[PDB]
């Protein structure tokens, strides 16, 4: 019960910190996508054109770079969140850097799911919606860059997690003892073990009807690793065909010798 209390207090701390760290939450995204509050819809080139006035070189490059710029803002928010996870800033600084390098894209994809449905994605802080079909229409090699993310999101969203759940799950992901090059695995696994028990208790309290949710969520962590792998490869291709396209230097730091 004092442990129970501690675990609930940890869940609460992380939820509070998540809210502070991430302006566009799942609750906020769901309210927008279901009308409880509509986004300008971009479904083709003409609507993209009309969209540029209403909300905020070649189109496919502009959209891809838009995705990168949004990722950069997510890295910032995730880094702030990570600093609030009890124990994190007390780790070896080399290890903190390794945990962020490998963790940030997995979190990006997790949280991107909140903004997605099977037909498209919220953009521009919820002021626009870009259709999946439109993102598939872009020229090679950009035609498919979002499809792995959509596929993940549709499956992930079927678990009906809320932000209080997500706050604990993303903490678990960052505190992964199996990242390459970690110097002190045991303190990381110790923190993750607390987070995992917090997660288990949260899901039991918050999703009593979902009998195997904890196990299902652990599997998603593994799935996240593959989208990242596939994304980095996709970037290799693009770095080949598109030598003139500037990449974002923060992302270059993250991607350098990643996998």
């Amino acid at each position: 019960n004092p442990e129970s209390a501690d675990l609930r207090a940890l869940a609460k701390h992380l939820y509070d910190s998540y809210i502070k760290s991430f302006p566009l939450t799942k609750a906020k995204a769901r309210a927008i996508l279901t009308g409880k509050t509509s986004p300008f819809v971009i479904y083709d080139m003409n609507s993209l054109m009309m969209g540029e006035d209403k909300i905020k070189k070649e189109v496919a490059i502009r959209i891809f770079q838009g995705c990168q710029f949004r990722s950069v803002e997510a890295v910032q928010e995730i880094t702030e969140y990570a600093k609030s996870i009890p124990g994190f800033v007390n780790l070896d600084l080399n290890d903190q850097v390794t945990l962020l390098k490998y963790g940030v894209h997995e979190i990006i994809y997790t949280m991107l799911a909140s903004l997605m449905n099977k037909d498209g994605v919220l953009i521009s802080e919820g002021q626009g919606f870009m259709t999946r079909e439109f993102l598939k229409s872009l020229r090679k090699p950009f035609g498919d860059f979002m499809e792995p993310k959509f596929e993940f999101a549709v499956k992930f969203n079927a678990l009906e997690l809320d932000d209080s759940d997500l706050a604990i799950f993303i903490a678990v992901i960052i505190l992964s003892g199996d990242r390459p090059g970690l110097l002190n695995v045991k303190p990381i696994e110790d923190i993750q073990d607390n987070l995992l028990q917090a997660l288990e208790l949260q899901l039991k309290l918050n999703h009593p009807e979902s009998s195997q949710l904890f196990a299902k969520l652990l599997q998603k962590m593994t799935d996240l690793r593959q989208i990242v792998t596939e994304h980095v490869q996709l970037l290799q291709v693009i770095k080949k065909t598109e030598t003139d396209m500037s990449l974002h230097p923060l992302l270059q730091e993250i991607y350098k010798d990643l996998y």
């Binding site: 890295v75 910032q76 880094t79 702030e80 990570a82 600093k83 600084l93 080399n94 903190q96 850097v97 962020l100 390098k101 230097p249 923060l250 730091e253 993250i254 350098k256």
Partner: peptide, 17 residues
């Protein structure tokens, strides 16, 4: 603060530290 790979992580270190 400083760390072994800082010279390759100016921007990330800016955020973390």
């Amino acid at each position: 603060x400083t760390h072994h790979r800082i010279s390759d992580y100016x921007r990330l270190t800016x955020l973390l530290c």
